[PDB]
Ligand binder design. Structure first.
Ligand SMILES: Nc1ncnc2c1ncn2[C@@H]1O[C@H](COP(=O)(O)OP(=O)(O)CP(=O)(O)O)[C@@H](O)[C@H]1O
Ligand SMILES: Nc1ncnc2c1ncn2[C@@H]1O[C@H](COP(=O)(O)OP(=O)(O)CP(=O)(O)O)[C@@H](O)[C@H]1O
Ligand SMILES: [Mg+2]
Ligand SMILES: [Mg+2]
Ligand SMILES: [Mg+2]
Ligand SMILES: [Mg+2]
Lengths: 282, 280
């Protein structure tokens, strides 16, 4: 791996901790302005039985995070140990864990329950994150609650860029393209046409919305993955989550339009959610 | 998905159970001669978040097992639910878990004798010999991919990466990119080829795991720097519970030059000999 000083972090200053392959760890001086300050962070590294592809994915994930730039709703890359030793990708620690676990643990006893506003606010932040990503020519391809992290201050953060790509780094029409994308969050064009665009992420955003309003429920319950695409082609779509407004449901439905261009853009989603969120506050 | 009556099993006769994605299950009449007897089996199916590649792998696995044929040291394929519903690959239930856990469980849960270890190795060589005779390359040989029945019978499993020796994209950069690096033959990566001799390299690693009682290969060496070391001649040291002879066999399996490694046929002959001596 090439040397990249701006991001390199001294191995001797990193104390690997318990597992979260990801593990918690302490990094001394990772924050330039606090040279002696130890910071709690997360570290992703290869497993002992990792494959060559696992490595290329880890490297790819790290580089995308470098080119993306910093944003409020995207997990932050803090540094990396890429020389004379195993590859370590150091990223910001999200104390509340992944969004799916977060929501399930806050389900009504039937922790601190989620208010309707919290759910709308969560969706809004994530829409902003995706809006930014798209402006950076980046397609995540793996959007899902399990891939969202929440910070101690409940800030939503898009994560796991293990499958993300530059808009131009997709091999259109090849049978092997998009073969490693979870089917239940995947846009029909991804497999049918073997393409991938920001609008493909919008479809994924929709399922994420459903996951959010079902408080961490599994999409297409009872429907096996090998039967899904037949049903989608036939017009099947998940049902309205309970306690979800028809308006938010229509938003989900709009994300699930078969024609990519008929789906809203992340910018449109952001403006709409912003309105719904503001009007709920008032 | 095509209909294969021969292997198709009725879903209504299958009752899924606890997790072992693989789950335990009870199958009624899976044994044709005993139409009313429920058999405890193991079922492999897709996870809710499975990918397209996860599906073709499962299909490939099922199809390979069909082609392979039956052998005492190969997890037996019992049937499959492929129509109108999720794909279920029903295989023989191995009550004692995978070899890696088995071995670590009985670390000085009844301690393994040198003979047991040799026997374990012998059985696996036999399975791989047959596998090889059927023109099949496993590609993912490892203790974690060996199951052990109630009678301590060794069984090679997880054919999720197995292929027909003739179905390999020779020299393509994307070839063999999903094989655990630490069990991988050097040529598998440097030249993008895979042959039976590539499997014997992995067998060598499997042997080291066995005699170390489930030890982790290349301890302390990250996968990132393993191939450079391998290219330089680095090889694992002899396991303490191992005889020099058996270690030499491992070294043989790890010869740089593929054609210079023994064949599974030769391994079985040598192992049988050693086993016959050890038991006498
Ligand atoms: N920065 C972080 N802070 C807190 N928890 C984190 C974290 N990074 C990862 N985790 C935890 O680890 C889980 C898996 O992380 P990630 O999605 O990056 O996994 P992964 O890329 O290794 C494998 P897969 O593709 O199977 O998820 C997260 O859902 C979360 O629970
Ligand atoms: N027939 C069987 N009987 C008993 N246990 C079984 C079994 N098949 C699988 N298992 C258990 O499940 C584990 C995983 O099995 P397998 O290796 O087939 O997994 P897999 O292909 O689903 C995933 P991976 O490729 O990550 O291992 C085994 O190591 C064993 O503990
Ligand atoms: Mg993930
Ligand atoms: Mg990942
Ligand atoms: Mg396995
Ligand atoms: Mg497998």
């Amino acid at each position: 791996l090439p040397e990249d000083p701006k991001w390199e972090f001294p191995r001797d200053k990193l104390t690997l901790g318990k597992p979260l392959q990801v593990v918690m760890a302490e990094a001394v001086g990772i924050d330039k302005d606090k040279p002696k300050e130890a910071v709690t962070v997360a570290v992703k590294m290869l497993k002992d039985d990792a494959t060559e592809e696992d490595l290329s994915d880890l490297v790819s994930e790290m580089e995308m995070m470098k080119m993306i730039g910093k944003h409020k709703n995207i997990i932050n890359l803090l540094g990396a140990c890429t020389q004379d030793g195993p590859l370590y990708v150091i990223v910001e620690y999200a104390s509340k864990g992944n969004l799916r676990e977060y929501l399930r643990a806050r389900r009504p006893p039937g922790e601190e329950q989620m208010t309707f506003k919290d759910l709308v606010s969560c969706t809004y932040q994530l829409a902003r994150g995706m809006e930014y990503l798209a402006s950076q020519k980046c397609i995540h391809r793996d959007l899902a609650a399990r891939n969202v992290l929440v910070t101690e201050n409940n800030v939503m953060k898009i994560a796991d860029f293990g499958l993300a790509r530059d808009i131009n780094n997709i091999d259109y029409y090849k049978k092997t393209t998009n073969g490693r994308l979870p089917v239940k969050w995947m846009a029909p064009e991804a497999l049918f046409d073997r393409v991938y665009t920001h609008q493909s992420d919008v479809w994924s955003f929709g399922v994420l919305m459903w996951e959010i309003f079902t408080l961490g429920g599994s999409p297409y319950p009872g429907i096996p993955v090998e039967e899904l695409f037949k049903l989608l082609k036939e017009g099947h779509r998940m049902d309205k989550p309970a306690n979800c407004t028809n308006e938010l449901y229509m938003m989900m439905r709009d994300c699930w339009h078969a024609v990519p261009s008929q789906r809203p853009t992340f910018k449109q989603l952001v403006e709409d959610l912003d309105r719904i969120l503001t009007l709920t506050t008032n």
